[PDB]
Amino acid sequence: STGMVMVHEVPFPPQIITSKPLSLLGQGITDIEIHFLQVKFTAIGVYLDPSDVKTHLDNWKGKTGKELAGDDDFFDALASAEMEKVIRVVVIKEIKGAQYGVQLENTVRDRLAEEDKYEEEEETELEKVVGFFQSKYFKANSVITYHFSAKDGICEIGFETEGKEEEKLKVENANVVGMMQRWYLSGSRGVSPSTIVSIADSISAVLT
Ligand SMILES: [Ca+2]
Ligand SMILES: [Ca+2]
Numbered sequence: 001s002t003g004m005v006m007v008h009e010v011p012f013p014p015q016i017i018t019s020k021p022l023s024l025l026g027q028g029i030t031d032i033e034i035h036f037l038q039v040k041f042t043a044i045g046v047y048l049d050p051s052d053v054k055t056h057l058d059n060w061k062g063k064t065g066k067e068l069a070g071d072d073d074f075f076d077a078l079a080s081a082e083m084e085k086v087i088r089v090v091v092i093k094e095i096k097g098a099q100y101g102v103q104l105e106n107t108v109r110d111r112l113a114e115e116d117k118y119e120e121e122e123e124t125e126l127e128k129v130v131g132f133f134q135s136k137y138f139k140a141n142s143v144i145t146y147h148f149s150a151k152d153g154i155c156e157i158g159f160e161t162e163g164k165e166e167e168k169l170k171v172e173n174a175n176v177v178g179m180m181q182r183w184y185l186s187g188s189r190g191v192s193p194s195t196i197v198s199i200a201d202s203i204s205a206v207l208t
Helices: 050-056 065-069 072-080 097-114 120-134 174-184 193-207
Strands: 005-007 010-012 015-017 021-034 037-048 085-091 143-148 155-160 167-171
Touching: 005 021, 005 037, 010 037, 010 085, 021 050, 021 193, 037 050, 037 193, 050 193, 065 193, 072 174, 072 193, 085 174, 097 120, 097 174, 120 155, 120 167, 120 174, 143 174, 155 174, 167 174
Parallel strands: none
Antiparallel strands: 005 010, 015 021, 021 037, 037 085, 085 143, 143 155, 155 167
């Protein structure tokens, strides 16, 4: 309708409208070096409302993108902030959904255990997220979306692929929802350093 933003040759809508318009403030990819070369697995887009950024992260105004990208307290504040966020992930390298699911599980479980926040309630919820992804095949251009509610720690996961009606999963465990968000939104521990740098630069501009 209004064009698409190309993130590593993958189209992303400039905005996504939930309760209000959210702008693509962060973009990047997840990759791994194999045989001396960069292998791109997914393209990522993080959507936030600039007004929410101004309302909840005003304490970081004046900071440069470089300063924000190197500060985990900033990203913890972004994750803790009661404003919605949408994380859109498009598959570049086709893989079994289980590969993505177990990577998520590994990091989320490890971090929750580190904070002594991994009991049977969290384990059960996390297993449902893993089960959601393992029943799917990630063809290139398949889209995974994470919609984080502003409050009450809720996340709705969506999976869309050509030919099938979109599939969704509602996650309600606050600890799991919070750590899933931090899997992407983490200064030094984010799965996509490129997206982190991008978000930092955008928010710096928003607050400046
Ligand atoms: Ca218990
Ligand atoms: Ca119990």
